[PDB]
Amino acid sequence: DSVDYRKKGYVTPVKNQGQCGSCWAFSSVGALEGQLKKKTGKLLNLSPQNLVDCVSENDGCGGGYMTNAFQYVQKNRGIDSEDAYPYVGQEESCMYNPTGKAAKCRGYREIPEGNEKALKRAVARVGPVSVAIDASLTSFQFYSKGVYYDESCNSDNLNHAVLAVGYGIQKGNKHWIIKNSWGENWGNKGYILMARNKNNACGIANLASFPKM
Numbered sequence: 001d002s003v004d005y006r007k008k009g010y011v012t013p014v015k016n017q018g019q020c021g022s023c024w025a026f027s028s029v030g031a032l033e034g035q036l037k038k039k040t041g042k043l044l045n046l047s048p049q050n051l052v053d054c055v056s057e058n059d060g061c062g063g064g065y066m067t068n069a070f071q072y073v074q075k076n077r078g079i080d081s082e083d084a085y086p087y088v089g090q091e092e093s094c095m096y097n098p099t100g101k102a103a104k105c106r107g108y109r110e111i112p113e114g115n116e117k118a119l120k121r122a123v124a125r126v127g128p129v130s131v132a133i134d135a136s137l138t139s140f141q142f143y144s145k146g147v148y149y150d151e152s153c154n155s156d157n158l159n160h161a162v163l164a165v166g167y168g169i170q171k172g173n174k175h176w177i178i179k180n181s182w183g184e185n186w187g188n189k190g191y192i193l194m195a196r197n198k199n200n201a202c203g204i205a206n207l208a209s210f211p212k213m
């Protein structure tokens with residue numbers, strides 16, 4: 001079927017990570033943002049800077065994993081709102097403040113590696129799923145429209161994290177609907193349609209996860 005969590009209110013506006021390699025932190029908050037609305041009914045901007053600064057399990061603006069993000073939130077007994085811990089585009093010391101807490105997490109759940117059907121089901125039943133992809137290519141950077149496909153995409157080269165907010169079909173072409181963190185001027189108002197069931201293009205289902213809540 002077709003699912004688009006943007007239309008269910010499950011998705012906040014597109015943010016801009018800037019030069020910082022904090023894509024993992026935006027992906028993570030995005031899956032969290034969606035699960036919080038699922039549980040509470042309210043939609044709130046969560047705080048990537050919290051993750052960047054405080055997930056020692058990761059490398060800040062030098063990269064990191066989504067899972068360690070989810071794991072931090074659980075162990076930490078929460079994550080701040082954007083407003084209480086605003087993004088500033090650079091690593092700093094952890095300034096997590098329990099008074100600013102907006103969301104919680106019971107750990108995470110991992111999609112079986114490279115299984116796009118498994119990713120489909122999880123997106124439908126759960127909500128927005130955090131994924132990692134090959135976003136190195138010139139075609140990705142200059143994406144504007146359509147179902148993104150590049151014959152040179154490397155599934156074993158996961159360099160960028162994003163959020164699968166849905167899936168669909170355009171003109172017979174199956175896709176994943178993907179929220180990125182390069183601002184509303186990149187791509188299609190910050191989003192990209194990426195090829196679905198085309199042999200796990202760009203490693204779309206290689207590193208997919210969502211937080212339990």
Ligand SMILES: CC(=O)N[C@H]1[C@H](O[C@H]2[C@H](O)[C@@H](O)[C@H](O[C@@H]3[C@@H](NC(C)=O)[C@H](O[C@H]4[C@H](O)[C@@H](O)[C@H](O[C@@H]5[C@@H](NC(C)=O)[C@H](O[C@H]6[C@H](O)[C@@H](O)[C@H](O)O[C@@H]6C(=O)O)O[C@H](CO)[C@@H]5OS(=O)(=O)O)O[C@@H]4C(=O)O)O[C@H](CO)[C@@H]3OS(=O)(=O)O)O[C@@H]2C(=O)O)O[C@H](CO)[C@H](OS(=O)(=O)O)[C@@H]1O
Nearest residue numbers: 001002003112115116117118119120121122123124125167
């Ligand atoms: C009362 C009513 O309204 N009836 C309608 C009628 O209906 C619809 C119904 O409304 C829909 O909800 C339904 O939706 C599909 C959904 N299928 C079903 C039946 O719900 C499909 O789902 C998944 C399912 O969730 C999952 O459990 C199943 O998985 C098991 C599988 N698991 C994994 C991890 O793979 C398991 O794995 C095996 C491996 O496969 C092996 O390789 C390995 O060796 O072993 C493992 C293992 O054992 O562990 O295997 C199991 C069994 O072997 C399961 O697999 S199974 O599915 O083959 O059984 O996988 C399902 C899948 O297909 O992936 O998801 C779909 C979309 O994601 C649909 O969901 S939905 O669209 O969101 O709803 O479909 C029903 C239907 O169409 O029949 O519809 C009628 C007419 O169409 C009437 O409607 S109408 O007349 O009113 O229009 C009627 O009213």
